[PDB]
Design a protein around this ligand. Structure first.
Ligand code: MET
Ligand SMILES: [Mg+2]
Ligand SMILES: [Mg+2]
Ligand SMILES: [Mg+2]
Ligand SMILES: [Mg+2]
Ligand SMILES: [Mg+2]
Ligand SMILES: [Mg+2]
Ligand SMILES: [Mg+2]
Ligand SMILES: [Mg+2]
Lengths: 36, 207
RNA sequence: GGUGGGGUAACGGCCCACCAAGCCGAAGAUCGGUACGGGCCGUGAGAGCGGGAGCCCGGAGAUGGACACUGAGACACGGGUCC
RNA sequence: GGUCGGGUCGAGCCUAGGCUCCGUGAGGGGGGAGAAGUCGUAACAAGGUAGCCGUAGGGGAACCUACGGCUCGAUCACCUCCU
RNA sequence: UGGAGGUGAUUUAAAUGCCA
RNA sequence: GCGGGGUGGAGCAGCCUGGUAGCUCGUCGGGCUCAUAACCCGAAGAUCGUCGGUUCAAAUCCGGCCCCCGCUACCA
């Protein structure tokens, strides 16, 4: 996903793995969701 | 008796009682009435939509061939159903395909005939004037899309969403195809009201 | 691009008939977007960066678009026609 | 000068044709900023089960399990390698 | 003198905190 | 044709096997922490619809009446 490794530092945010997985659940959508 | 004989079904059941031996086994009964044409026992037919199967990773159905095991209206013996009354048509299929009103609003025509199926359906729709069947009647709003509405196709039914909401017609995306023997067949649109999906227009299917 | 021709004051596919497959292109073709160019001005230690209304030598329009008369001189700002 | 024919260059109009120039305009999904509203405690130490990356599956929400990899992980027992 | 690496072990139920 | 419970504010436990409504969420209050919630323990709390019978003696075994009423005659 063209990683940018300044984000994993978990300082004032949330994990990165479990944000990727949630962006997929919306790209799979705006692709499927009447993006036809 | 000119267009393709179609029985627009309303019921579908299994005769086999709990504990029926494998010798007097039956297909399923599928029941509508003959509005255009006439159907006959032992006739080649296809039912629609009927059975859904995973073909090439997406979702789709199967129009199902069979012939009739018998025809009746209840408790009298005849063999070829003509127009008039909900006729019951017992077939050569599997019974598990038919129990528990799985194909409620099924359609039957010939396995050499034409009735289309479309995931995306175009329907010219006419707005209703007020909230008829309710305690409370509020205005009918001109909406934008992405709302989820119930579209009942004659005896068929589905959900639908949309991307282009034209003034007079609608281009709705579904999850299950249509039973549309010809032009402008009556599919109706209902919007949720407090868990009660009431009418917001009557539409006719253009194909 | 070639042979052979009419045309303008003058050479030119500038135009015509014939004959063949050439022309450019990632050392940026085509298409989109912006601007009138050059003497020079503003700043800066200098290397650069940014601007080219006002003065002089260039180039083009006369409400939008087309076309001719007269004269050496042009399709003519205070000359002529059509839409 | 006029009028008929033939030919010649040519705006506009006009059918139909998609492109781009839009006042808008109908449900929407997120997004940024308010942290005396409500729900819970994942992150920092061995954060109370160590954490963190790639694929997959699930979950009222932060999150949980499944094989393959690194120290940006702390102590006891024990080695082994050098200084 | 100080580490520098490896194998094992490494423990019930323990949630949260106005105001300058 | 019947047939069931006839229960504290709430789950109704407990009914032939007979004497303590029987625990559990909830209401008052007392403990522990600094303070909250979790946690602990006393208190309140109906006393079996109701008239009875049987029963030394009771929901406990059997009946009058009535509360609410829960299952009474579908596969083309
Ligand atoms: C599904 S067919 C319904 C009709 C049937 N004969 C009854 O009665
Ligand atoms: Mg970096
Ligand atoms: Mg020549
Ligand atoms: Mg250009
Ligand atoms: Mg923690
Ligand atoms: Mg942890
Ligand atoms: Mg490696
Ligand atoms: Mg533990
Ligand atoms: Mg407390």
């Amino acid at each position: 996903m063209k990683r940018r490794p300044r984000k994993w530092k978990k300082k004032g945010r949330m994990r990165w793995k479990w944000i990727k997985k949630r962006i997929r659940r919306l790209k799979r959508q705006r692709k499927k969701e009447r993006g036809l | 008796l000119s267009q393709k004989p179609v029985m627009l079904v309303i019921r579908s059941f299994d005769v086999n009682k709990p504990g029926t031996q494998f010798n007097e086994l039956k297909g399923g009964v599928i029941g509508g009435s003959i509005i255009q044409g006439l159907f006959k026992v032992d006739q080649e037919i296809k039912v629609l939509p009927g059975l859904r199967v995973e073909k090439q990773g997406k979702v789709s159905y199967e129009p199902i061939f069979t012939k009739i095991s018998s025809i009746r209206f209840g408790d009298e013996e005849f063999k070829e159903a003509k127009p008039g009354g909900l006729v019951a048509i017992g077939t050569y299929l599997d019974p598990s395909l038919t129990k528990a009103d799985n194909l409620l609003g099924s359609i039957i025509t010939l396995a050499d005939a034409e009735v289309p199926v479309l995931w995306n359906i175009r329907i010219k729709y006419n707005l209703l004037e007020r909230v008829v069947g309710a305690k409370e009647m509020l205005k009918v709003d001109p909406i934008r899309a992405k709302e989820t509405l119930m579209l009942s196709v004659g005896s068929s039914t589905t959900l639908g969403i949309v991307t282009s909401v034209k003034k007079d017609e609608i281009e709705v995306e579904l999850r299950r195809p249509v039973a549309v023997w010809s032009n402008n067949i009556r599919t109706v649109i209902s919007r949720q009201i407090a868990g009660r999906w009431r009418m917001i227009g009557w539409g006719l299917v253009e194909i």
